[PDB]
Amino acid sequence: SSQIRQNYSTEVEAAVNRLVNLYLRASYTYLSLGFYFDRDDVALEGVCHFFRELAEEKREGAERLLKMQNQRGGRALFQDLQKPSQDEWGTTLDAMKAAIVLEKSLNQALLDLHALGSCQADPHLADFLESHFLDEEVKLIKKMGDHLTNIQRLVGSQAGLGEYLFERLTLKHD
Amino acid sequence: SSQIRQNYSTEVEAAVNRLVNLYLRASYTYLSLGFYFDRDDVALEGVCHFFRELAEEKREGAERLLKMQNQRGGRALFQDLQKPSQDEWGTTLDAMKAAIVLEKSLNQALLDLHALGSCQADPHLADFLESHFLDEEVKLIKKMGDHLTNIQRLVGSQAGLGEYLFERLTLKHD
Amino acid sequence: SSQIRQNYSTEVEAAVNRLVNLYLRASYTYLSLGFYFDRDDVALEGVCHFFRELAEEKREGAERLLKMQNQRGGRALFQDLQKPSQDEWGTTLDAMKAAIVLEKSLNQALLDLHALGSCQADPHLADFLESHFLDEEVKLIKKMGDHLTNIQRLVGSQAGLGEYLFERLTLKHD
Amino acid sequence: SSQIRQNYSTEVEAAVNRLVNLYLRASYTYLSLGFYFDRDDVALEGVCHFFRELAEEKREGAERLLKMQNQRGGRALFQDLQKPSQDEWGTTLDAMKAAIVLEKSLNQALLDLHALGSCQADPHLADFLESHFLDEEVKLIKKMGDHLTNIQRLVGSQAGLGEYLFERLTLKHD
Amino acid sequence: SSQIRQNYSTEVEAAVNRLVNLYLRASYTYLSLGFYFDRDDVALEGVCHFFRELAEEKREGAERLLKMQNQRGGRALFQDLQKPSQDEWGTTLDAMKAAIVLEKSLNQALLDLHALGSCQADPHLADFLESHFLDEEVKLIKKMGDHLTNIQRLVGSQAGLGEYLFERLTLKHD
Amino acid sequence: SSQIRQNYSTEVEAAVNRLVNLYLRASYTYLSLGFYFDRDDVALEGVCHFFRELAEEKREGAERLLKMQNQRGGRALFQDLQKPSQDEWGTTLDAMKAAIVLEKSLNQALLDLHALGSCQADPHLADFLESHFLDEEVKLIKKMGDHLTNIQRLVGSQAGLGEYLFERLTLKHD
Numbered sequence A, B, C, D, E, F: 001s002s003q004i005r006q007n008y009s010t011e012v013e014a015a016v017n018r019l020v021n022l023y024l025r026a027s028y029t030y031l032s033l034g035f036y037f038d039r040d041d042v043a044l045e046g047v048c049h050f051f052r053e054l055a056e057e058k059r060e061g062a063e064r065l066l067k068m069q070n071q072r073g074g075r076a077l078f079q080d081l082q083k084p085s086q087d088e089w090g091t092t093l094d095a096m097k098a099a100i101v102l103e104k105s106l107n108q109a110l111l112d113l114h115a116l117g118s119c120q121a122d123p124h125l126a127d128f129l130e131s132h133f134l135d136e137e138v139k140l141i142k143k144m145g146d147h148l149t150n151i152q153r154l155v156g157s158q159a160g161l162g163e164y165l166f167e168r169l170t171l172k173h174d
């Protein structure tokens, strides 16, 4: 703004910019996961699709946060997007564990920003997160956990066979 | 879980299990109310329908709570369902008063769990209740109060005639 | 009633109330089974769906029994619903065995009530059970037995893999 | 009520009546703005439409607040509606500045009532405001600010020409 | 204007502004009536709907008057809207009597303005009122009188029963 | 691969990874441009849309490059995405100049990679670029140049008025 800004603290404004960076980094990590599973020597198309769709979801979250920054009169500021933590992601099990770790770290950042906004008596911020992010993250984390249990069930013995079956029979593919 | 659980206190987990029990008990009480009004010596079909639909609503609430328990990584635990407080429910007026008492007790339990979750800095829980339960209860309680006033208006004099008219002209029936 | 009651013994009236309780307890047991399989550390969606649909079927049976109680002029009386026998249900095999045990106990109660009604020369009761319950139970018990054999075939060796395949390829899921 | 009222403080009840008055006063101010721009010596049809639609929006907000007062068992009490602050509203720029001032004052009243309700542990009130008012106000204030910037851009030089172009090319008209 | 004003006296211009105020005050009185009948301790939905629709009709009349003020080149001037005469409105009979009193006072103001305009040889004003207001008021007053007679017929004896029947069987409701 | 890789040099593989980084950096720069023009103190919706659509186009280019990396048996490797060169982007003219600079730098990188691939006798790479990138860049650069000329024509005198008109009459908006 400063023509529209009202009840929007500098602390929240900066934390929103940080959360945009976290969501875009998550979207980048998922881009990397997706194309790893499209390698000809990995070749699990369902897994690739699963992570490519999450890359899109996380970019959308970032964009909603940026829209909101501007609705409140804050200034979007971008930082570098750190490269993902790995160049190769292992098995579907390794990948799904890394994804759940990533999601829990995003969820904690959401929770932290909600607490700041509730502290700052910023109910628009708090409801924004409640309405568009918190349940999306709980639903995604539950789906990931369900996947992890199924993958684990499958790859106790006959790990190859189990990885193929999960990709074929649980994950969406052509 | 414990693979997905995050920011979900044992206190909230137990209170959610208790609230499931309260909703299922309410659904049972409404089952009983419904079939009481289907007796050939009571025979108020609109009233029966009204309570049978509330039995379904309260079971749905319980099921949403149980879904949520699992989304958060808590463990659903069931207790006995206590039989309803009465075997015979009197007149439509008596029944509607009992229903409003029941609803207010469910609403207070919701309010209590919201307070616990807000105390515990559990905004997913608080929003879950706000989004799916609190306004449903306020709307139902208002409808019940509107009914009670109409029933009372009718059964001051000519109590039989008034009970019949309310069932015929206010409540949904075939 | 007592304006409509005809050829409807106190013994049958009480046994019908007991059978309503048994069906509602079975529906509760299936609720518990269903949500157990929705746990993130169990995560067998087909199995959850299978038991949640049986919860609905058993509640419907109870409701038909209650309708019938009132059609005959008897008085519905509700008792407590005892909590299910277990809080955690083990593997799909354990669960399906428990379900078959439960069904056989409901079937025996049906058979017992049919015998009482035939003894009491109550052909409406006997036909009611024949028409709406006995073949439903035989068909369900046969489906359960078919499932049990398939589960057993699968989990002799590679128990995880087999549990996943059964849920994926036999049970209805999204 | 007092048959339905639960967890609804006298402080909130009175503040809701005050907020109804503020919304209806805002709707009146917008009525005046609208018809000012319909004057033959002002004659900016888009601007008239813009303010007449806001008059309707603010009346709708008041009506939702009054519905809610009754849902909670409070008593609606009306006060006079003070005449708008001006009889003539100047240029589109003057008018849009006055509108943003008005909106910010409504938003602050919303924020104030949210704080009271959160203080009073009234989560239905707080969610009611979050769900139906706070983001509507943030979205409207942002649209007004976007308009103000465009109007300002236009009327630096050639103020007549710029006022006409904004009305023609930004605002909805026939 | 003063570019368009022709044959439009200052006396008529001021009386039109006064009549706008009277119509908006009537619309406010009807808002209050409407929400009174939506109270849970009043609870006559047809009556609420009846008065809420009249609130809309009276606002529309005010808006047509304001449009006309501007068509003729007069200047709309707004005054405060006085709060309604009562905070609680009694029975349907009391309310309908108050409404007929209100309508007759609006009708007299219309008649008075018609006389002024005919005196001033302002046939556009006179026809405007004839075409859009006078018969609308006569039709509404007749409907109110028909209602009053029916309410009176009903609440001679068994006043509660009669109030319920009128709302149910005469007034439009869901 | 290395099961599928054929005629695909390490030099091309690395240059493709670099070009992915350049396209994703361009997409990030356009994200920033887009949200700058959505600021309430900038407020040029057409310009925002124009840059947000380019953010999507550049991400799509990166994704096609990554698909191709894997089709050829190379290994995608991601680096950090450097933050954009500016935090605030000035006027539409400044922004469009920065965009043309950015595009020309991407085009040169395409040309450079084409030369490498033609040097390496890698006709699949060369045709891939010819078919999916080179004419897309020439068409975009021409559109940008057409825009720049129009913006310049407009903001010689009356820079505000001209910026508004270009956004309104050239760029796609709601």
Ligand SMILES: *C1=CC(=O)N(CCNC(=O)c2cccc(O)c2O)C1=O
Residues within 6 Å of the ligand: A114, A115, A116, A118, A119, A120, B117, B118, B120, B121, B122, B123, B124, B126
């Ligand atoms: C330090 C600031 C402060 O007041 N405090 C509380 C903020 N509130 C919450 O974290 C919270 C969480 C969930 C629901 C609520 O309604 C709620 O207030 C701090 O953290």
Ligand SMILES: *C1=CC(=O)N(CCNC(=O)c2cccc(O)c2O)C1=O
Residues within 6 Å of the ligand: B114, B115, B116, B118, B119, B120, D117, D118, D120, D121, D122, D123, D124, D126
């Ligand atoms: C004891 C725990 C605590 O902090 N305290 C406050 C919890 N907050 C609320 O009850 C409440 C109610 C409605 C809206 C809110 O935003 C809100 O924080 C306790 O009860």
Ligand SMILES: *C1=CC(=O)N(CCNC(=O)c2cccc(O)c2O)C1=O
Residues within 6 Å of the ligand: C114, C115, C116, C118, C119, C120
């Ligand atoms: C004790 C009461 C009595 O008479 N006796 C027989 C009831 N009949 C049956 O059990 C039966 C079962 C299946 C078909 C029939 O037609 C039928 O009579 C007792 O159990």
Ligand SMILES: *C1=CC(=O)N(CCNC(=O)c2cccc(O)c2O)C1=O
Residues within 6 Å of the ligand: A117, A118, A120, A121, A122, A123, A124, A126, D114, D115, D116, D118, D119, D120
């Ligand atoms: C004085 C009453 C009180 O407890 N205190 C806090 C009320 N809470 C908030 O204002 C608030 C704002 C935004 C989100 C929340 O969750 C929240 O509790 C007072 O103002």
Ligand SMILES: *C1=CC(=O)N(CCNC(=O)c2cccc(O)c2O)C1=O
Residues within 6 Å of the ligand: E114, E115, E116, E118, E119, E120
């Ligand atoms: C004082 C002004 C004047 O001339 N006089 C008459 C106005 N005319 C009427 O009141 C009237 C009413 C109905 C139909 C007509 O055609 C008509 O002229 C005054 O009141």
Ligand SMILES: *C1=CC(=O)N(CCNC(=O)c2cccc(O)c2O)C1=O
Residues within 6 Å of the ligand: F114, F115, F116, F118, F119, F120
């Ligand atoms: C150094 C490698 C080499 O041979 N040399 C030529 C590559 N060819 C081209 O750059 C080119 C450009 C456009 C169309 C062609 O058909 C074509 O060969 C080097 O740069």
